[PDB]
Amino acid sequence: VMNRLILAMDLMNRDDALRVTGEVREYIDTVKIGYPLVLSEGMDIIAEFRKRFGCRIIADFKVADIPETNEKICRATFKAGADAIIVHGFPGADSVRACLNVAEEMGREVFLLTEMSHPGAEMFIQGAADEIARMGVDLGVKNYVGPSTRPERLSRLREIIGQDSFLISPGVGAQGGDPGETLRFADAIIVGRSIYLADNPAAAAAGIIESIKD
Amino acid sequence: VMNRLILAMDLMNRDDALRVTGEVREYIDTVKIGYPLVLSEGMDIIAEFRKRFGCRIIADFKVADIPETNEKICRATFKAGADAIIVHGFPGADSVRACLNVAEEMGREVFLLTEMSHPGAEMFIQGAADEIARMGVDLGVKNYVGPSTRPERLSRLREIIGQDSFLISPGVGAQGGDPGETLRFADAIIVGRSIYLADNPAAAAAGIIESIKD
Ligand SMILES: *c1c(F)c(=O)[nH]c(=O)n1[C@@H]1O[C@H](COP(=O)(O)O)[C@@H](O)[C@H]1O
Ligand SMILES: *c1c(F)c(=O)[nH]c(=O)n1[C@@H]1O[C@H](COP(=O)(O)O)[C@@H](O)[C@H]1O
Numbered sequence: 001v002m003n004r005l006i007l008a009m010d011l012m013n014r015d016d017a018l019r020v021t022g023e024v025r026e027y028i029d030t031v032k033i034g035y036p037l038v039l040s041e042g043m044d045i046i047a048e049f050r051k052r053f054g055c056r057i058i059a060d061f062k063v064a065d066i067p068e069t070n071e072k073i074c075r076a077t078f079k080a081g082a083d084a085i086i087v088h089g090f091p092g093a094d095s096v097r098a099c100l101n102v103a104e105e106m107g108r109e110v111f112l113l114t115e116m117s118h119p120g121a122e123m124f125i126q127g128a129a130d131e132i133a134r135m136g137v138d139l140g141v142k143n144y145v146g147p148s149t150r151p152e153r154l155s156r157l158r159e160i161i162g163q164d165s166f167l168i169s170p171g172v173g174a175q176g177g178d179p180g181e182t183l184r185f186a187d188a189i190i191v192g193r194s195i196y197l198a199d200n201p202a203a204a205a206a207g208i209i210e211s212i213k214d
Numbered sequence: 215v216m217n218r219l220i221l222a223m224d225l226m227n228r229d230d231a232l233r234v235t236g237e238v239r240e241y242i243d244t245v246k247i248g249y250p251l252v253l254s255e256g257m258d259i260i261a262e263f264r265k266r267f268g269c270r271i272i273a274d275f276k277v278a279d280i281p282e283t284n285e286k287i288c289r290a291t292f293k294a295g296a297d298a299i300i301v302h303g304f305p306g307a308d309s310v311r312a313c314l315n316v317a318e319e320m321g322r323e324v325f326l327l328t329e330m331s332h333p334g335a336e337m338f339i340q341g342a343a344d345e346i347a348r349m350g351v352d353l354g355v356k357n358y359v360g361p362s363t364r365p366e367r368l369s370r371l372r373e374i375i376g377q378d379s380f381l382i383s384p385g386v387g388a389q390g391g392d393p394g395e396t397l398r399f400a401d402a403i404i405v406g407r408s409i410y411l412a413d414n415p416a417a418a419a420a421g422i423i424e425s426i427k428d
């Protein structure tokens with residue numbers, strides 16, 4: 001992705017979301033759109049962003065239902081124009097496979113969320129996360145999400161998924177993660193609030209790239 | 215809830231969803247709306263259903279993000295008129311607390327999803343599910359979801375949450391669960407496909423109630 005930086009666009013107003021994304025477009029390739037924006041403005045926002053900015057769109061829906069419903073969610077999300085969807089691994093292999101089947105049907109991609117970045121991830125997810133990553137490898141998943149806030153865990157996750165796999169990482173900035181130490185292991189960093197709440201989002205994005213280019 | 219039966223309305227077309235829900239309205243109190251319908255027709259569908267049928271609406275969004283984003287998702291969902299939201303416990307106590315805080319602000323309810331009903335739930339969720347339920351009790355959660363497909367697990371979950379707590383249960387019918395054996399432990403059963411894919415959804419709903427009334 002351009003400059004190894006993915007914008008987490010979690011503003012809830014279409015005008016603010018369009019403004020900030022336009023301001024930082026020269027620094028990014030890829031916009032991650034989640035439920036804060038979609039549940040506020042509708043699924044049409046995906047196609048609008050894709051068209052207006054010409055950026056790849058990852059739908060960060062952290063899909064975590066039964067196989068049947070996961071299929072439905074993925075179908076609707078790809079129909080809306082998303083290039084990829086983020087799905088949780090914790091619900092197990094059948095739920096993940098359902099997403100992979102739809103992505104196959106529609107020539108799109110699945111990212112498997114292994115360990116989450118927030119403190120509560122330590123309670124239950126962390127203990128399962130290595131296994132979740134191996135399950136991904138066993139299912140042929142090539143794209144993964146893991147936590148900027150725990151680079152030792154990123155390292156381990158990278159070890160499991162191999163060098164070929166594509167690994168993106170949230171928790172940079174607001175949650176305490178560092179761009180440099182995350183990119184030792186991840187291919188790309190996800191950044192939301194440090195950019196979209198900044199007085200000058202372009203300056204914030206540019207500053208992050210300036211720490212990446214080194 | 216009326217007749218202890220909650221309709222899982224996962225059709226993806228507004229007209230079909232309205233038709234089936236209208237047909238079974240005399241048998242239900244409560245409609246569960248999830249992402250299959252919302253991602254197809256928009257969040258406005260919640261207020262439409264609530265108004266047109268005068269039914270309580272549970273938004274089954276299986277919320278599974280970090281605290282900050284969970285707050286945003288819950289806010290948008292209650293703003294759209296939902297009475298309650300289903301959230302995953304697996305991401306940990308902070309993520310659950312975030313949802314409880316918004317439900318407090320807005321005089322609404324959270325249901326904590328403990329163990330899921332599908333086969334893949336055995337991989338990771340089942341091993342954490344008793345703890346997830348205890349975490350709920352420790353946070354003051356009063357409403358829970360657990361699996362019709364494993365009544366021995368329902369029993370254990372009921373044991374942890376106590377008799378006061380309200381427990382609803384999916385996996386009846388299509389997934390193999392039985393109305394009678396689920397209602398030994400759950401207060402209400404969730405039923406989707408057995409009703410909404412039936413040639414006569416009212417007859418299917420009525421048949422389920424006829425097995426409940428006994
Ligand atoms: C999702 C997830 F599964 C994580 O483990 N961590 C995480 O933060 N998210 C989502 O990533 C973005 C982080 O944005 P920022 O903290 O930079 O504002 C958000 O979209 C969050 O939902
Ligand atoms: C969600 C969940 F967390 C479960 O453990 N099981 C489950 O099935 N769901 C959702 O409940 C409904 C079941 O409907 P049915 O199988 O009767 O068609 C669906 O909305 C499913 O997403």
